[PDB]
Design a protein around this ligand. Structure first.
Ligand SMILES: [Mg+2]
Ligand SMILES: [Mg+2]
Ligand SMILES: [Mg+2]
Lengths: 196, 81, 54, 184, 53, 49, 293
């Protein structure tokens, strides 16, 4: 037909029972929204909700990648400017436009280099959106509680070592001087928790 | 997709092809011409041939390669003549 | 090792006394060569730049 | 009261306060010295320093030190922070590999292009454009060109930047290198 | 569904089939533009690096 | 009257797997090199340069 | 406009938007074009005169050189030649760097049967297979690559140790004789004014207070040094420098500026070793509880 299968006349087409009860979700998300902008839940580009996602957390650092506009950013010509600065600081009797020419030659190239990189990076944003991004569909991996199951696995281990007993228990912290301030008969080092 | 090539074969024809690019390119320069026999295969065939006559690895390789090169020598001699 | 070495006085409680000597053993990777496997995003874009300008 | 060396109040200056340890030559810091740099002759110590400081900052050591040496944090919050850090790292790596796997494709398209240039102008021509000495004639021209390449390749020393430390009010993080809000 | 490396939805490549360079360049090929051509040789089957630990 | 080199110098980018310099094709060839005897796009274009 | 900020310049429609492109800038001087064209052509002809490929070449006159190549000497040659260059080149284009190194090595090198052991002999040598792969250098080995104290400071009975400590809200500096005798008192960012009842705490421990403090301390440090040396009989009259070991506590901001204020004294103070002592907390006594934890 004339347009998408997952979007009908009035908005997104409501498959699960969540959409029949809560049909705001059919047509609304964010400020950036249009009627053709449903079913693509990502909006245009440079636009509100355009950001591609990677394992659910959106990608807002793209420029930072290609080393345009970053604190760590890629630097084209250094030897130039340091050479010219050196000259400028040495003495005022002789003057060097011999260096300034080398240098501004360098910059003159740098311009087209940058337009190139920016271009290629926009191509990356597109490729990424097609073949990698899940469009904010999958659960975050980037915060420790999202890995809770993993941590649990190790708590379990420390428990079975303890005769299957103290879960999530840890050794009591002692003192800075713990070992050397304590008389005989008292524990000088922190024990396993089951061994209290 | 699974390589029909067993890793030994891989090592062999890959090594053959790194010793000479002409042997590698021959059948397929641009697209694969697949109804013509190719040097890489012919040479692998007579490699195994040598091996089962008890010629060792290195010598068999340089020998097969010499075969291809002397054939090529004939050809380009005719070309010049 | 570091623990024993320290309590015997054969290694300092802070710092690396062999830091320079040890640089041979470390794979110092020159910005001029390219290794296809890096988590360095800078080096990649650097060689991209180099070849495009070429 | 007795403070550690990385403590806030550590080296005090007051009428009562006095500094602890043999303070010169062979010193209190004798084997406690984290870094040693012999200054090369005719080298400003500002390069020396900015190299040291860049080093510590990029390897996140000055991070750690600032962090632990200011205030106390329970082993749980410390865990939460180090693991959060490490997991965000994991994520961003898995991003970089994607970027890079694309960029090697970009570079491939560039090199491919360069090949097409080759068979438009012929290989040798392309080579000429690339700085080939075919006018080289005698060795003296080669030596001028290579004296050019020599004077290029020899590296000027890097001034590399170290982000300043931001002092906020009650100092929720003394790791603060930027004004962005953090999750403690 | 995810790739292991960076979580891609596809297996990476540049080229796959033997003919694609030919078939793409076809009128050039009949023309005979492609005879000494080194771009259709060098990179024809070229595939990505293994970026892997 | 009053009135070049790259931004970097690197070695050669690695060779992608499946990629090779085509056979009988001299990569390093200059204009002070000798003229090859035949007529190829390559030989004719170097000649013409 | 009204109680709000004026927009940035580019937020307005173009100032010259109504003036046609031909006008900005005007191209005038069209009169001179023709003149300078004829001029340049006449010039060219002169440059042709200063200095002063369709020589018909028949293919039948060449035949001898063709028969030269049909002899299998020359084809033995071409075969050898072509088998050399078939070896899988990694170059792909003329590269400036690699050329440079190559010819660099040509300048460096212009400046510069016993029975084969079988596989069985190496089967009986366990050691050999561990020699082939080993990292460890075999030959007399350099001693300076072993000894502990190799890269480390080397002091002198006369050296002054300058301590620059950068703290969060403060920075200070001192000096000490090698035998640990204190020279002048500790100049501090709150000792020198520079601190309280002022611009703020945020800038208190800043870069230039560290600078102020160090440049103020060195200034006073010189004369008392000449005194302490005048006492023991070391005149240190002229053309002399003070050998300095700069020890730095830090990672705070006041560090940078501090050392800079030393660098400008390079005509007086000679810095032999720059080594920082910054405490690292493995674990220890509780630090003061901050706001959140
Ligand atoms: Mg939103
Ligand atoms: Mg008390
Ligand atoms: Mg509470």
């Amino acid at each position: 037909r004339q347009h998408d299968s997952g979007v009908n006349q009035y908005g997104l087409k409501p498959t699960n029972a969540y959409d029949y009860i809560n049909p705001t979700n059919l047509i609304n998300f964010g400020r950036g929204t249009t009627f053709d902008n449903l079913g693509v839940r990502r909006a245009g580009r440079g636009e509100i909700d355009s950001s591609p996602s990677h394992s659910g957390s959106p990608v807002f650092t793209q420029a930072k990648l290609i080393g345009l506009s970053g604190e760590e950013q890629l630097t084209m010509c250094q030897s130039e400017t340091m050479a010219l600065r050196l000259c400028m600081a040495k003495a005022g009797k002789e003057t060097c436009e011999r260096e300034s020419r080398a240098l501004d030659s360098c910059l003159g190239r740098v311009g087209h280099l940058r337009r190139a990189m920016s271009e290629a990076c926009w191509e990356f944003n597109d490729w990424f959106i097609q073949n990698v991004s899940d469009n904010h569909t999958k659960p975050f991996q980037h915060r420790p509680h999202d890995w809770r199951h993993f941590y649990a696995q190790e708590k379990l281990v420390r428990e079975r070592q303890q005769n299957g007993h103290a879960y999530g228990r840890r050794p009591k912290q002692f003192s800075f001087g713990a070992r050397y301030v304590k008389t005989d008969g008292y524990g000088k080092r922190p024990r396993l928790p089951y061994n209290k | 997709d699974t390589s029909t090539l067993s890793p030994e074969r891989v090592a062999l024809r890959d090594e053959l092809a790194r010793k000479s690019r002409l042997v590698a390119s021959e059948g397929m320069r641009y697209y694969n011409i697949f109804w013509v026999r190719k040097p890489l295969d012919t040479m692998e065939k007579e490699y195994y041939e040598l091996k089962r006559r008890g010629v060792d690895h290195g010598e068999a390789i340089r020998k097969v390669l010499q075969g291809f090169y002397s054939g090529l020598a004939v050809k380009k001699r005719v070309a010049a003549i | 090792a570091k623990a024993q070495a320290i309590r015997i006085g054969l290694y300092p409680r802070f710092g690396n006394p062999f830091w320079f000597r040890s640089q041979k053993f470390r794979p110092k990777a020159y910005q001029e060569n390219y290794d296809p496997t890096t988590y360095s995003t800078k080096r990649t874009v650097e060689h991209f730049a180099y070849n495009w300008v070429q | 009261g007795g403070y550690m060396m990385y403590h806030r109040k550590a080296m005090g200056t007051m009428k009562y306060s006095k500094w602890k340890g043999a303070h010169g030559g062979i010193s209190h810091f004798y084997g406690r010295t984290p870094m040693v740099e012999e200054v090369r002759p005719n080298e400003p110590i500002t390069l020396v320093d900015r190299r040291i400081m860049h080093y510590v900052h990029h390897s996140r050591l000055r991070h750690f030190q600032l962090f632990r040496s200011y205030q106390e944090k329970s082993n749980s919050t410390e865990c939460k922070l180090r693991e959060g850090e490490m997991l965000r790292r994991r994520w961003h790596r898995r991003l970089q590999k994607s970027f890079i796997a694309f960029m090697q494709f970009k570079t491939m398209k560039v090199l491919e292009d360069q090949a097409r240039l080759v068979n438009t102008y012929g290989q040798a021509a392309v080579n000429a454009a690339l700085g080939d000495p075919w006018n080289a004639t005698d060795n003296v021209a080669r030596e001028r060109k290579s004296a050019a390449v020599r004077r290029q390749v020899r590296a000027l020393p890097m001034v590399n930047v170290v982000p300043k430390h931001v002092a906020t009010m009650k100092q929720i993080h003394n790791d603060r290198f930027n004004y962005r809000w953090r999750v403690n | 569904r995810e790739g292991w490396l960076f979580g891609q939805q596809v297996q990476l490549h540049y080229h796959r089939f033997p003919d694609e360079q030919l078939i793409t360049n076809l009128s050039r090929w009949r023309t005979g533009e492609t005879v000494g051509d080194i771009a259709m040789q060098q990179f024809r089957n070229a595939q990505p690096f293994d970026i892997e630990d | 009257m009053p009135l070049h080199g790259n931004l970097f110098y690197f070695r050669e980018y690695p060779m992608y797997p499946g990629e090779y310099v085509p056979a009988e094709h001299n990569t390093l060839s200059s204009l002070r090199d000798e003229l090859r005897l035949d007529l190829t796009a390559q030989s004719l274009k170097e000649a013409w340069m | 406009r009204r109680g709000k900020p004026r927009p940035r310049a580019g937020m307005f429609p173009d100032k010259y938007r109504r003036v046609p492109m031909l006008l900005k800038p005007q191209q005038g001087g069209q009169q001179y074009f023709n003149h300078f064209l004829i001029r340049s052509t006449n010039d060219r002809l002169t440059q042709q005169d200063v200095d002063n490929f369709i020589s018909p070449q028949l293919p039948q006159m060449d035949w001898r050189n063709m028969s030269a190549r049909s002899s299998e000497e020359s084809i033995r040659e071409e075969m050898r030649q072509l088998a050399e260059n078939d070896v899988m080149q990694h170059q792909r284009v003329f590269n400036e760097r690699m050329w440079y190194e190559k010819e660099e090595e040509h300048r460096m090198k212009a400046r510069s049967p016993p029975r084969v052991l079988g596989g069985d002999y190496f089967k009986t040598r366990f050691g050999y297979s561990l020699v082939k792969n080993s990292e460890m250098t075999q030959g007399p080995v350099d001693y300076s690559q072993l000894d502990m104290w190799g890269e480390m400071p080397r002091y002198t009975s006369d050296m002054v140790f300058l301590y620059l400590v950068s703290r969060r809200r403060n920075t200070y500096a001192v000096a000490y004789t090698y035998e640990g005798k204190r020279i002048l008192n500790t100049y501090t960012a709150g000792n020198r004014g520079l601190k309280g009842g002022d611009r703020g705490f945020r800038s208190e421990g800043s870069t230039d207070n560290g600078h102020q403090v160090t440049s103020m301390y060195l200034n006073d440090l010189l004369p008392k040094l000449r005194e302490m040396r005048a006492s023991e009989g070391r005149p240190m009259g002229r053309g002399e420098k003070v050998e300095l070991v700069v020890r730095v506590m830090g990672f705070y901001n006041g560090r940078q500026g501090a050392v800079r204020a030393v660098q400008d004294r390079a005509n007086e103070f000679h810095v032999r070793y720059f080594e920082d002592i910054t405490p690292f907390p493995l674990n220890g006594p509780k630090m003061p509880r901050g706001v959140f934890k």
